[PDB]
Each structure stands twice: as structure tokens, then as C-alpha cells.
């Protein structure tokens, strides 16, 4: 029998986020993502009231944003842990749930304030100019150009989700796997490469 018990799907464990990232909560969030990393602080809960001890192990993540629910959807990248003299480093799949719900709750921040105020002021100058430009018998250009430029410049910004510091979160292993040491991995790889037919 192996020293590492099999990890079944749906096993969960709580943890503390070490360093946070700002989620690119745009329409293309899932492509241009920002990594983040968290440390374990509990014992993994196996499904039938079973526990295994992984603590202080690091998990590398890779997350984006979702503005509709203002929660930062994560995607686990790798598991890292160094027990005693042996080393663990594997690729796993999972997510993080905060306060009993998927993702991590947070607020949205935008930087359009001053730029939008300037654009509105320019267009207001356009409106007053066109109003004066009406009274006749039987400024607008500066406003239109600067308003177009300000709109094009302010369009660059996108919602950002600030998540990090030392909040409490919970990690879930969406797919089951088997923990195995780096030396064990290299021994297997060599055995497979041997083509022992």
C-alpha cells in the first residue's frame, strides 16, 4: 500500500490566501488572467469523514474576474508541498469557494471618474454652444473633438476586482488524483521509457 492515500473528487480543504491578484473582469477575462497563490492551514476533508494531513503546502492559482456576480473565478494550477525530506509537485484541477459560495466575493473598482467628468463637461460646452448657435434671423468643434478623444481614451479601462491580503477561503479538488513523490515520478517515467514489453 502507498503512503499517500488516493484523493477522491469533491474533497475540500480550507486555506488562507497568501498574496492576491487583481482580476481582469472583462469580456476576455479567461484569457489574460493574473496568477495568485495561497497556503494551506487545515486538514483535507475526504468524503466519508476521512482526513489526511497536508498543511503549509502551497497552491499556485490562475484566476480571472466575473463582473455580474463580482466574484473572482479561480482555477488551480499546481500543488506544492515539501514533507520531511521528500518533495511534492503535481498538476491538479480545482476551484476556491469563499463564504460557502463559488469564487471569492469582492467589489468592483473603475478609474473613469475624472475622464468621464471631462468628457461630460466638453459635451456640455457643445450643448450650450449649439443652443447659442440656434438663435438667429428668419463652442461645438472643440467639444466634439475632445469628447471623441476622451471616449476613445476612457474605453481602455475595464473593471478590476481587488482580492488578496489575508482573507479566509476554501479549496476544493474538483477531480480526484494520487499524490506521488518527485523521485517516485522520475522512477515511473524511466520505467515507462524502458518499454518493458
Amino acid at each position: 500500500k502507498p503512503r499517500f492515500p488516493w484523493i477522491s473528487s469533491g474533497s475540500f480543504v480550507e486555506a488562507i490566501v497568501v498574496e492576491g491578484a487583481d482580476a481582469n473582469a472583462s469580456v476576455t477575462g479567461d484569457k489574460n488572467t493574473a496568477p495568485m497563490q495561497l497556503r494551506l492551514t487545515g486538514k483535507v476533508q475526504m468524503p466519508n469523514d476521512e482526513e489526511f494531513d497536508l498543511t503549509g503546502c502551497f497552491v499556485t492559482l490562475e484566476a480571472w474576474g466575473d463582473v455580474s456576480s463580482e466574484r473572482a473565478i479561480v482555477r488551480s494550477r499546481s500543488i506544492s508541498c515539501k514533507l520531511g525530506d521528500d518533495d511534492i509537485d503535481q498538476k491538479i484541477a480545482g476551484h476556491v469557494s469563499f463564504m460557502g459560495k463559488n469564487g471569492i466575493k469582492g467589489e468592483v473598482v473603475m478609474r473613469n471618474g475624472q475622464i468621464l467628468l471631462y468628457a461630460g463637461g466638453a459635451g456640455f460646452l457643445d450643448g450650450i454652444g449649439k443652443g447659442i448657435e440656434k438663435a438667429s434671423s428668419t463652442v461645438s468643434s472643440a467639444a466634439k473633438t475632445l469628447s471623441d478623444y476622451y471616449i476613445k481614451r476612457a474605453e481602455q479601462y475595464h473593471p478590476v476586482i481587488p482580492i488578496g491580503a489575508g482573507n479566509e477561503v476554501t479549496l476544493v479538488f474538483q477531480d480526484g488524483f494520487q499524490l506521488e513523490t518527485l523521485e517516485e515520478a522520475r522512477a515511473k517515467a524511466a520505467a515507462r521509457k524502458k518499454q518493458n514489453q
Binding site: 486555506a15 488562507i16 490566501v17 497568501v18 498574496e19 492576491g20 497556503r39 494551506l40 492551514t41 487545515g42 486538514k43 498543511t55 503549509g56 469563499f98 463564504m99 459560495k101 471569492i104 466575493k105 469582492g106 467589489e107 481587488p162 482580492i163 488578496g164 491580503a165 489575508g166 482573507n167
Partner: protein, 37 residues
């Protein structure tokens, strides 16, 4: 306005307390031993 309700019910969120990630590792270190006990 939005036709359906525009508010949530949890009303709890994360607090970014500008805390250095170096202390974050230390903060998780002692808590893990304490919660385990």
C-alpha cells in the same frame, strides 16, 4: 433601474488590509497550529 431585485443577501466581502504577503505566510503559520491544537 433593474426590474428584478438588485441586491444580494450575503452582504459579506473580503477586506484588502494592505497586508504584506510575507506576514501572510506567518499569519497562516501560527493559526494552523492553533486551530489544530
Amino acid at each position: 433601474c433593474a426590474g428584478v431585485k438588485s441586491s444580494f443577501d450575503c452582504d459579506a466581502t473580503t477586506s484588502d488590509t494592505c497586508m504584506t504577503m510575507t506576514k501572510a505566510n506567518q499569519l497562516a503559520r501560527d493559526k494552523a497550529a492553533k486551530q489544530a491544537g
